[PDB]
Design a protein around this ligand. Structure first.
Ligand SMILES: [Zn+2]
Ligand SMILES: [Zn+2]
Lengths: 272, 307
């Protein structure tokens, strides 16, 4: 349901959290097929057969069967994506409870988002929204290891400060050690940490789509944990991701307008 | 053993490793074998009839039956699990077991307890005692003067005699702490182990770090009683003032003896360090010592019967 508050705050409330999580579980189990097949069963079967770690769902099917979620999706994509991670984890564990050792996580990708913006036109009005876009990869660094649930040795006493989740926005920083009570020079325990693959690509508008008097514009993009090395330089790629501003990128330094960089946490990369 | 509870022995002392070593397999630091001491005392239980048992001075003690077996019979007919093991009976029977008990009490005594419980439950299957029988070893060879005791009898069962002065109020102390997770209400008992508790530091259910809080009045407490006692030594050197000694009684012996009562006291001589100041956790080189109590003999051959 809808109220005066914003969509993001709404979906942050626990009542609608349970509402939409239940709805996602419901159509995951019940949206059978165009022609009565229960396609999610077979998709999950192949997903666990390979241990793909990542499911993908069609936005047309999503919106058509259940449209409230589809409308909410570009507004506050991060929260919806986290909940659908949890719900997909529930359903895959239901189908194969043996999956528990397998990555303890499932990502979910959204395909065929209807409204494609163009890299020339991505303004303030798209921040913190899931957009679809096209381009060509001009650069793609190697796969690097990222912290995802990091444990820290308090190097005053070698207590293992527990596994802190690592959001993409700001680097996690423990306050103090629960044992010796010091905000000490903590340092990462290389082993108990469970890292996550991180790759950084840069897409740009294709010259076939650039206009007459122009320079093609380029947007960064971050691939994480399953999409790394899913695209090489020069690949014409569709990218779907949360156009994003609030990580630490900002020209707060001297000699600069108060002007922010941007990225795209890629949620689906599709070569063409 | 049927399954009766093994309630800890606060008066014997804090536990230890019980480290054993081969030279068969003796206890480290001691010339004791668990098997040898256990078997010798089982023999002492099953076959020790008195050479003389004056019925007038020892009512209920015969000259025919084995001595302590009918004591086990009375400990079956009534419910108090305590057996008066006369150390001089042990001296007459087996001098080696005397040496081992009155050199190594806190470890020989649990074996004696094990043997007694084993024999008793073998004899009586359906008898039910609230917990294991405990052996009270007393009338050890009287040391005369505390001021003439030496630093070699620490933790070594001694005996003296004297009059009480004060029996202060009970003092609970921890034996099995209770912890509850502040977040998820997961409970856990933590046994006191060798002189200090183990604060769990992680919930067993929700894994929160240091969310475990110590609920006080759910714990387990044995009691205590400081019992300041004035010695009546039989040896009075030329200017030794009246010696007075602290007695810490525990769960079963507390408030069994009032001020002014005259008692032989057999008990574990126990050095414990002295804190430098009440709040600083340092200690002193120059320990105190205080007799514990394993037994008070009320009876005296010179005095008359007590109240
Ligand atoms: Zn620490
Ligand atoms: Zn808990």
């Amino acid at each position: 349901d809808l109220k005066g508050h914003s969509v993001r705050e709404w979906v942050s409330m626990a009542g609608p959290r349970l509402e939409i999580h239940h709805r996602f579980k419901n159509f995951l189990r019940t949206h059978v097929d165009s022609h009565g097949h229960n396609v999610f069963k077979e998709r999950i079967s192949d997903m666990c057969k390979e241990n793909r770690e990542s499911l993908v769902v069609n936005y047309e099917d999503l919106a058509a069967r259940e449209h409230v979620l589809a409308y909410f999706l570009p507004e506050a994509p991060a929260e919806l994506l986290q909940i659908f991670d949890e719900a997909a984890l529930e359903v895959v564990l239901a189908m194969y409870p043996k999956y528990d050792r397998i990555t303890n996580h499932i990502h979910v990708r959204i395909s065929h988002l209807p409204l494609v913006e163009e890299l020339r036109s991505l303004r303030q009005l798209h921040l913190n929204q899931l957009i679809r876009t096209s381009g060509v990869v001009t650069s793609c660094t190697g796969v690097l290891p990222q912290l995802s649930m990091v444990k820290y040795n308090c190097n005053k006493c070698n207590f293992v400060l527990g596994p802190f989740c690592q959001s993409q926005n700001q680097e996690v920083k423990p306050g103090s050690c629960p044992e010796c009570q010091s905000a000490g020079p903590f340092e990462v325990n290389m082993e108990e940490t469970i890292y996550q693959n991180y790759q950084r690509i840069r897409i740009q508008e294709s010259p076939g789509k650039v206009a007459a008097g122009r320079l093609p514009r380029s947007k960064d993009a971050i691939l994480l944990a399953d999409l790394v090395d899913s695209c090489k330089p020069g690949d014409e790629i569709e990218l779907t991701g949360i156009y994003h501003n609030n990580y630490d990128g900002s020209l707060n330094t001297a000699n600069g307008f108060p002007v922010f960089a941007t990225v795209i946490l890629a949620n689906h990369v599709a070569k063409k | 053993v049927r399954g009766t509870p093994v309630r800890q022995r606060p008066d014997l002392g804090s536990a230890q490793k019980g480290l054993q070593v081969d030279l068969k397999l003796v206890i480290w630091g001691t010339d004791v074998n668990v098997a040898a001491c256990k078997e010798n005392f089982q023999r002492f239980l099953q076959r020790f009839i008195d050479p003389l048992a004056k019925e007038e001075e020892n009512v209920g003690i015969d000259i025919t039956e084995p001595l302590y077996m009918q004591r086990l019979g009375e400990i079956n007919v009534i419910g108090e699990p305590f057996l008066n093991v006369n150390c001089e009976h042990i001296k007459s029977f087996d001098k080696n077991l005397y040496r081992q008990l009155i050199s190594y009490p806190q470890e020989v005594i649990p074996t004696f307890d094990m043997a007694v419980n084993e024999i008793f439950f073998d004899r009586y299957p359906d008898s039910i005692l609230e917990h294991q029988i405990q052996v009270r070893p007393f009338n050890a060879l009287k040391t005369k003067n505390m001021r003439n005791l030496n630093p070699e009898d620490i933790d070594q069962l001694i005996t003296i005699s004297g009059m009480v002065i004060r029996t202060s109020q009970l003092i609970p102390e921890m034996q099995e702490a209770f912890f509850q997770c502040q977040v998820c209400a997961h409970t856990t008992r933590v046994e006191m182990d060798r002189g200090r508790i183990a604060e769990p530091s992680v919930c067993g259910r929700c894994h929160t770090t240091h969310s475990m809080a110590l609920i006080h009045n759910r714990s387990l407490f044995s009691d205590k009683q400081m019992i300041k006692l004035q010695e009546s030594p039989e040896d009075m050197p030329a200017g030794q003032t009246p010696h007075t000694v602290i007695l810490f009684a525990h769960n079963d012996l507390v408030d069994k003896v009032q001020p002014g009562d005259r008692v032989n006291v057999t008990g574990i001589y126990r050095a414990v360090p002295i804190r430098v100041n009440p709040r600083v956790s340092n200690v002193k080189s120059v320990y105190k010592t205080h007799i514990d109590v394993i037994h008070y003999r009320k009876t005296d051959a010179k005095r008359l019967h007590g109240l």
